[PDB]
Design a protein around this ligand. Structure first.
Ligand code: CL
Ligand code: CL
Ligand code: CL
Ligand code: CL
Ligand code: CL
Ligand code: CL
Ligand code: CL
Ligand code: CL
Ligand code: MG
Ligand code: MG
Ligand code: MG
Ligand code: MG
Ligand code: MG
Ligand code: MG
Ligand code: MG
Ligand code: MG
Ligand code: MG
Ligand code: MG
Ligand code: MG
Ligand code: MG
Ligand code: MG
Ligand code: MG
Ligand code: MG
Ligand code: MG
Ligand code: MG
Ligand code: MG
Ligand code: MG
Ligand code: MG
Ligand code: MG
Ligand code: MG
Ligand code: MG
Ligand code: MG
Ligand code: MG
Ligand code: MG
Ligand code: MG
Ligand code: MG
Ligand code: MG
Ligand code: MG
Ligand code: MG
Ligand code: MG
Ligand code: MG
Ligand code: MG
Ligand code: MG
Ligand code: MG
Ligand code: MG
Ligand code: MG
Ligand code: MG
Ligand code: MG
Ligand code: MG
Ligand code: MG
Ligand code: MG
Ligand code: MG
Ligand code: MG
Ligand code: MG
Ligand code: MG
Ligand code: MG
Ligand code: MG
Ligand code: MG
Ligand code: ZN
Lengths: 207, 101, 87, 119, 50, 149
RNA sequence: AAACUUUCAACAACGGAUCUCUUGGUUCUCGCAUCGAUGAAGAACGCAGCGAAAUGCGAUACGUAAUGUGAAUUGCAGAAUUCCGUGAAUCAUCGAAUCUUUGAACGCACAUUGCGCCCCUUGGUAUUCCAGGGGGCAUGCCUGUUUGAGCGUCAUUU
RNA sequence: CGUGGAGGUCAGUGACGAAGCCUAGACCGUAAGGUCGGGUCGAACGGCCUCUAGUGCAGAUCUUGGUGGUAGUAGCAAAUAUUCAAAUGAGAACUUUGAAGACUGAAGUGGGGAAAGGUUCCACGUCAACAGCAGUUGGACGUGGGUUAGUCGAUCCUAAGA
RNA sequence: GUCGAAUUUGGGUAUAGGGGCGAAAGACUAAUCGAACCAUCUAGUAGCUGGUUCCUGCCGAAGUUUCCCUCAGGAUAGCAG
RNA sequence: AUAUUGGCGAGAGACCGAUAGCGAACAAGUACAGUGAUGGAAAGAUGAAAAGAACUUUGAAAAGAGAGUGAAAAAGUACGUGAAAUUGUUGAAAGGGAAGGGCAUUUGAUCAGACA
RNA sequence: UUGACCUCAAAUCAGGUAGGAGUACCCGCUGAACUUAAGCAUAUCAAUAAGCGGAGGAAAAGAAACCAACCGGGAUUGC
């Protein structure tokens, strides 16, 4: 608040009274009288350089350089060593990148969506997310950030016929349209090598 | 500097006249028909001291021409005027001490 | 003699209780309240006194009538009575 | 214990006035007993019964007056709609919809047409 | 003083009734954290300012 | 206060400027509000195209006179040459500007052609109220674009 | 050599740091437009079986009526018939009422619970005196009504 | 090197004891610091790759709070003055009763009031705190009781004035 | 010292901050007077005083020139990284 | 189409975490001070549940010592954790007008490492 | 005499209306100094704070006695 620490009429006593020249509350009869005020070293005072709303919050990035980072992230998903080094359990997956049938886009139920993901080798990555849930280690718990968990596979599609809703409740699994790939998902924490399951229609549309 | 003594008197706070014991404003009669054409006789009732005034005052009673009552006038007494004396005021008054002409 | 011996001569009140605001701020000889300005029609208030406004502003009291305006507006200032339903 | 509002509404004003007197007499004797007993919670229901009777009597009297002023263009201010001060001073629906003869001819002749970009 | 207006006497009557201890049965109520009357007044310590 | 080889700067911050700082935190919020407002306006106005037809005019000044843009409304002469009155034109979705005048034959002919093409591409529902349900086209500018001659 | 003084450890004091906790604060975004002479905001004084405060309320006083829910309230006492029900509740909702003395505050005054006038009614052997109850009497301005003023001025009689 | 918070990761640690705190006990680093054992304790917390800041105190006659030496020290010496016995009580130089010795000496340490205070008035119960010793006592604490007008005042009148 | 008066004093009332009041001391105007008190402008400005919080490694000064209402301060060149 | 540190209804944060954050997380614009305009605090945490310690004994009493409740009285309404300054007791050591420090070794106490 | 007109009054005449509060934002009036200029008076701070009057959910502005000098544009408001 801009008025915090300045809702007083305090005035310095000046020298000659054997006390520091800090401004002091006037009046008497309350205990607050005579105490220091207005200072960044004073209890109940104003902080040094109070924070303002016109601090810069968002950052501009060149559009072409932004697309450069996205293209590098996509190419990193095809390197098995990078995917393993990012913590994904793809040790016994036959080929990277993993491409599945287009009918995955038409799955309506979570139960059959999970079965399809496990049948192509993503079972171990799913179990990693479930067993990694932990309580946060600080004051962020009561700032609506109470639990943390690992990131699972990313499923990329060309047309959404129910795949988005079917995987919505699965912990750690998120979907993405091939036309609007997000760098925040492809390189979480600025670490390359996201485990991506491509749909055949989406894989063709990359060209 | 500050406001000097003679400037402060115009505000009239503690420099007003002390008029509690005054007998009243000393004035002649109002100029009327009897005064401007003839004369009217008045009687001196008493001669009294007035606070704040060196000269004594005389109380003179006249009759009201237009209704039945008495009217009281406060005059400044001249030398020789005495209680019980008749006072004549008007255009046709005689040339005697105490008369108003 | 201007200190302790002078403090012993204090037995006449400059201010008494105000009929409007209830503070001991009604000047006896000036016949006016130094806090709310009574008997002037308006209540005295000043922008340099931000705290003074806060002590007496709307919401510091009971709001006997203004409490229910929002509820009445939310129902569109309806007239009549609620009809008897089942159960 | 206590009276029922729906039972009181089926009674004439003469009966309600008599019942109010009886409740007042009962309240007076209970206050005498309160000075001796350690506690007397029964006095609460008697006070609420008096409040209920006064409520029903006031409802009947106000309803009767509404029949006397039915249809008339002037009614007592307590029987008029409250709303707000500003809402009572605003133009009525009839006043706000008034138009001049010149304007209504234009409105009928050239109203906003309904059209689409098809062919 | 012995001579007092009605307003002053009414003001003094209310202050007398507010100067009493808190009842004990209130302290046993669920979620009760009140211990002593923090607005207690003594005639020789704090003046009413009247 | 003046030192080194630096450009002379003029930063006008000697008033109480911090009391008049406007940060557009609601840039994304206002975009949602405008899109919501456009959607609810389209549903309110039936199949009407949400915008009025505009003429093509020459931009003033020697700097910008090489281009044509959209003007406020068709002149009275342009409307009359199209074969209808100004009052009826306003109720049919055509903007009319009475203070613009025609002095160039090229501009006048082009705006006449725009009005004729617009009339042949719209359907006017009768006042009876049968109102056949036709699909709503949300833009008349896209349907009738402006091309540089 | 003890006492005494000093340093360290254990246990016990003094004090309330640290750690963990949070029905609070702060900032951003979205939606809405509703005070008052039909007496507002604010102030005073009162109201509970046992309450000082806070909260609620106005002599119908931690509430009345109405609607919904469907069995509590709870510190104790009490009430129990309120339990297959026009019905428990410090419940929710809320469109009917009550709303002391005040306050722009309005019969005149107010450092006074001070002093008048009018209408209807009741009592005191009473249109006149006294008392109870009910209802009234501020100012500026607008439209209308009524009663008037002025050789300002018109017409018409003697 | 260390601190609050943020993205990622170690499918990290933990009620079979997390964090914090105490520990002339052990180990690593030139150092900022890091690690382990023991005790106390009770619910969250850490390593690594990166992001971010209201990020590191011995001082400012610094702010708030707490605590020392001084020190059982300065002192508790104006207003002539106290003493014996009994009663009460766990307890009496100080409470009550009696006796004695004294003082105020009628411009009083007497008997009433105006301002101002506001229940301090009275009785019963009662001593943790207050009465700079004491206390069974109190203007203290708890619970109750008490202010009665045609003639006393206000109310009415006018003064300077508002 | 003075003690029957230019006496002492209660209550009421009047004068308000560049104003008041003053048998005059720059006295008094609520312990405040060679211009009261309260809140705000206000985090007023300071070439002047004080303070300015972790480690290690490498390099390492100046009190001199010219101009300035410049002489307890800056600009400028030099020295340093 | 624009404005909005007020009012009412909502959703949020790489914000603060009881000397912080609004002055106020609590009977806070409260207690209290000033003739007045105004000034204006401090103060959050027993335990899952009071199960808030029956009874015995000493004392005039406050309390103490036992017993008991509880997972824990190293949680007892002076209540979670309980640091420092400062203090008591016990144990060890030194001390001829300060104390404390650096290098080296004696003495006392105490301790890890390898027994391949 | 009688009846109009004009103007000006009265009534506890019939029916209404204004005041006060709030004031973040809005429409006006009034109006400083600290400060900067390394001093200082014009200037700056600022057509700002304080003071006063008046509204709404927005207010105000608004369909040109406009801008232009072009092949002309065409109410107001905001970016
Ligand atoms: Cl900032
Ligand atoms: Cl966890
Ligand atoms: Cl003088
Ligand atoms: Cl008294
Ligand atoms: Cl190290
Ligand atoms: Cl003044
Ligand atoms: Cl708050
Ligand atoms: Cl004050
Ligand atoms: Mg100091
Ligand atoms: Mg200090
Ligand atoms: Mg603060
Ligand atoms: Mg680019
Ligand atoms: Mg931590
Ligand atoms: Mg003085
Ligand atoms: Mg005096
Ligand atoms: Mg006075
Ligand atoms: Mg003001
Ligand atoms: Mg007492
Ligand atoms: Mg006293
Ligand atoms: Mg541990
Ligand atoms: Mg130690
Ligand atoms: Mg716990
Ligand atoms: Mg800091
Ligand atoms: Mg320190
Ligand atoms: Mg230092
Ligand atoms: Mg210090
Ligand atoms: Mg001594
Ligand atoms: Mg001594
Ligand atoms: Mg002495
Ligand atoms: Mg003596
Ligand atoms: Mg003597
Ligand atoms: Mg004697
Ligand atoms: Mg007594
Ligand atoms: Mg003592
Ligand atoms: Mg004692
Ligand atoms: Mg007491
Ligand atoms: Mg005298
Ligand atoms: Mg001199
Ligand atoms: Mg500063
Ligand atoms: Mg300053
Ligand atoms: Mg070197
Ligand atoms: Mg120096
Ligand atoms: Mg705080
Ligand atoms: Mg618990
Ligand atoms: Mg434990
Ligand atoms: Mg503890
Ligand atoms: Mg210690
Ligand atoms: Mg009338
Ligand atoms: Mg404006
Ligand atoms: Mg200057
Ligand atoms: Mg300067
Ligand atoms: Mg100067
Ligand atoms: Mg202003
Ligand atoms: Mg409004
Ligand atoms: Mg709008
Ligand atoms: Mg408008
Ligand atoms: Mg025009
Ligand atoms: Mg324009
Ligand atoms: Zn007042």
């Amino acid at each position: 608040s801009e008025k915090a620490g300045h809702q007083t009429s305090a005035e310095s006593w000046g020298t000659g009274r054997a006390v520091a020249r800090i401004p002091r509350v006037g009046g008497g009869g309350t205990g607050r009288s005579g105490q220091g005020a207005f200072g960044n070293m004073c209890r109940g005072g104003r902080m040094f350089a109070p924070t303002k709303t016109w601090r810069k919050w968002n950052v501009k990035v060149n559009h072409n350089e932004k697309r450069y980072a996205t293209a590098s992230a996509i190419a990193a998903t095809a390197v098995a060593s990078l995917v393993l080094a990012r913590g994904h359990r793809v040790e016994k997956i036959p080929e990277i990148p993993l491409v599945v049938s287009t009918d995955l886009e038409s799955i309506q139920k979570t139960k059959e969506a999970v079965a399809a993901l496990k049948a192509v080798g993503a079972h171990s990555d799913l179990l990693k997310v479930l067993k990694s849930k932990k309580l946060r280690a600080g004051k962020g718990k009561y700032r609506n950030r109470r639990w943390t968990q690992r990131r699972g596979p990313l499923v990329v599609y060309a047309e959404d016929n129910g795949i988005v809703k079917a995987l919505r409740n699965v912990p750690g699994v998120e979907t993405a349209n091939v036309a609007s790939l997000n760098l925040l998902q492809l390189a979480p924490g600025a670490h390359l090598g996201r485990f991506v399951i491509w749909t055949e229609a989406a894989f063709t549309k990359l060209d | 500097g500050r406001v000097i003594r003679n400037q402060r008197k115009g505000a009239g706070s503690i420099f007003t006249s002390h008029t509690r014991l005054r007998q009243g404003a000393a004035k002649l009669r109002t100029l009327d028909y009897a005064e401007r054409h003839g004369y009217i006789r008045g009687i001196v009732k008493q001669i009294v001291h007035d606070s704040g005034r060196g000269a004594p005052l005389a109380k003179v009673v006249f009759r009201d021409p237009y209704k039945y009552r008495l009217r009281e006038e406060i005059f400044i007494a001249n030398e020789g005027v005495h209680t019980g004396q008749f006072i004549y005021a008007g255009k046709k008054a005689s040339l005697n001490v105490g008369n108003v002409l | 003699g201007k200190g302790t011996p002078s403090f012993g001569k204090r037995h006449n009140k400059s201010h008494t209780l105000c009929n409007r605001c209830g503070r001991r701020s009604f000047h006896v000889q000036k016949k006016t309240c130094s806090s709310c300005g009574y008997p002037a029609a308006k209540t005295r208030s000043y922008n340099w006194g931000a705290k003074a406004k806060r002590r007496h502003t709307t919401g510091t009291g009971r709001m006997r009538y203004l409490k229910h305006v929002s509820r009445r507006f939310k129902n569109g200032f309806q007239t009549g009575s609620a009809s008897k339903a089942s159960a | 214990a206590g009276v029922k509002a729906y039972e009181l509404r089926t009674k004439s004003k003469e009966q309600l006035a008599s019942q109010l007197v009886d409740l007042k007499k009962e309240l007076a004797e209970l206050k005498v007993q309160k000075l001796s007993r350690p506690s007397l919670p029964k006095i609460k229901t008697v006070r609420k019964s008096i409040a209920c009777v006064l409520t029903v009597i006031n409802e009947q009297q106000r309803e009767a007056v509404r029949q006397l002023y039915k249809g008339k263009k002037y009614q007592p201010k307590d029987l008029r709609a409250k709303k707000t001060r500003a809402l009572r001073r605003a133009l009525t629906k009839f006043e706000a919809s008034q138009v001049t003869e010149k304007q209504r001819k234009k409105q009928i002749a050239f109203p906003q047409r309904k059209y689409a970009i098809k062919a | 003083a012995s001579h007092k207006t009605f307003r002053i006497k009414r003001f003094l009557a209310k202050k007398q009734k507010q100067n009493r201890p808190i009842p004990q049965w209130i302290q046993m109520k669920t979620g009760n954290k009140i211990m002593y009357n923090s607005k207690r007044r003594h005639w020789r310590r704090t003046k009413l300012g009247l | 206060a003046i030192s080194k080889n630096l450009p002379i700067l003029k930063n006008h911050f000697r008033k109480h400027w911090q009391e008049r700082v406007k940060v557009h935190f609601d840039q994304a919020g206002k975009k949602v509000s405008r899109r919501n407002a456009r959607a609810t306006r389209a549903a309110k106005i039936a199949p009407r195209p949400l915008d009025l037809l505009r003429p093509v005019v020459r931009a003033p000044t020697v700097k910008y006179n090489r281009k044509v843009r959209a003007g406020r409304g068709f002149t009275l002469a342009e409307v009359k040459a199209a074969g209808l009155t100004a009052a009826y034109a306003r109720t049919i979705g055509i903007a009319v500007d009475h203070r613009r005048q025609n002095r160039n034959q090229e501009i006048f002919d082009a705006n006449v052609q725009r009005l004729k093409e617009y009339q042949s591409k719209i359907i006017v529902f009768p006042r009876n109220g049968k109102a056949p349900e036709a699909e709503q086209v949300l833009s008349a500018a896209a349907t009738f674009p402006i091309a540089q001659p």
